[PDB]
Amino acid sequence: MEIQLQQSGPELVKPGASVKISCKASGYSFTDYIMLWVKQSHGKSLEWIGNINPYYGSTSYNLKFKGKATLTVDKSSSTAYMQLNSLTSEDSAVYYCARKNYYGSSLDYWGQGTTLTVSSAKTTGSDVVMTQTPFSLPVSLGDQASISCRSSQSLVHSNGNTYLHWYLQKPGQSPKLLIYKVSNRFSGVPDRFSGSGSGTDFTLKISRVEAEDLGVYFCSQSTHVPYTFGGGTKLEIK
Numbered sequence: 001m002e003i004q005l006q007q008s009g010p011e012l013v014k015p016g017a018s019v020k021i022s023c024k025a026s027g028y029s030f031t032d033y034i035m036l037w038v039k040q041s042h043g044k045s046l047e048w049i050g051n052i053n054p055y056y057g058s059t060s061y062n063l064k065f066k067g068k069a070t071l072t073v074d075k076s077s078s079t080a081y082m083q084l085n086s087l088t089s090e091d092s093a094v095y096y097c098a099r100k101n102y103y104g105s106s107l108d109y110w111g112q113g114t115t116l117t118v119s120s121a122k123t124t125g126s127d128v129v130m131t132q133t134p135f136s137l138p139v140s141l142g143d144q145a146s147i148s149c150r151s152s153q154s155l156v157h158s159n160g161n162t163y164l165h166w167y168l169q170k171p172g173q174s175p176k177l178l179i180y181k182v183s184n185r186f187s188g189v190p191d192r193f194s195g196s197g198s199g200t201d202f203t204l205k206i207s208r209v210e211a212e213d214l215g216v217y218f219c220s221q222s223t224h225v226p227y228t229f230g231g232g233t234k235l236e237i238k
């Protein structure tokens with residue numbers, strides 16, 4: 001128990017059917033942290049589905065998923081749920097659940113993810129934009145990487161803090177928090193990583209790229225609602 005979010009297993013369902021993915025929490029006070037859900041279609045970026053306050057059962061969705069996904073919580077068990085209705089081939093993705101803290105309003109803990117396959121086969125406006133540049137970054141190891149992230153609006157908050165974070169997602173893995181609030185390294189994150197920038201400009205730099213660092217980097221803003229993610233920047237070797 002060190003903060004674990006264990007989601008239910010793979011799903012193969014029939015179109016028009018419903019599924020109900022689960023996220024069992026442990027290692028922390030379930031009721032003291034907001035649970036947020038994310039959708040990631042193959043090769044696509046992260047889509048905020050919506051979040052729930054396990055404490056009240058209060059929710060807020062991404063206009064896009066409202067009426068489609070239903071978030072619930074079972075306090076007596078520290079398990080949060082997301083139900084999907086009228087399933088479509090388009091809902092075939094990998095869904096994640098993640099805890100969002102308050103001090104940095106970043107997603108510090110993610111579940112392993114739940115792959116959903118919708119099929120009849122029986123075996124397998126005003127939202128803030130985040131633009132990541134470049135799309136892909138080929139390097140030779142020991143090389144220095146420098147990724148940039150730009151938002152359509154300033155990300156400074158009334159409190160004087162800027163909620164821009166960097167997540168890293170290694171192949172087949174769940175994304176993970178690297179840097180929160182522009183330049184703070186998350187726990188266990190090496191010093192070769194270092195964020196910077198202000199208002200609308202932000203850059204992630206990796207002085208020395210290493211095999212453990214390859215994967216896709218996502219910046220995300222949360223000083224505005226909804227929460228948005230950059231398209232992602234893939235770091236791979238030549």
Ligand SMILES: CO[C@H]1O[C@H](CO)[C@@H](O)[C@H](O)[C@@H]1O
Nearest residue numbers: 102105157163222223224225
């Ligand atoms: C939910 O509490 C958070 O509200 C907004 C996001 O909605 C954040 O930017 C702010 O810093 C607070 O930590």
Ligand SMILES: [Mg+2]
Nearest residue numbers: 059060061066
């Ligand atoms: Mg709503």
Ligand SMILES: [Mg+2]
Nearest residue numbers: 060061225226
């Ligand atoms: Mg509202």
Ligand SMILES: [Mg+2]
Nearest residue numbers: 103159160161
């Ligand atoms: Mg503060």
Ligand SMILES: [Mg+2]
Nearest residue numbers: 157158159160
């Ligand atoms: Mg204030």
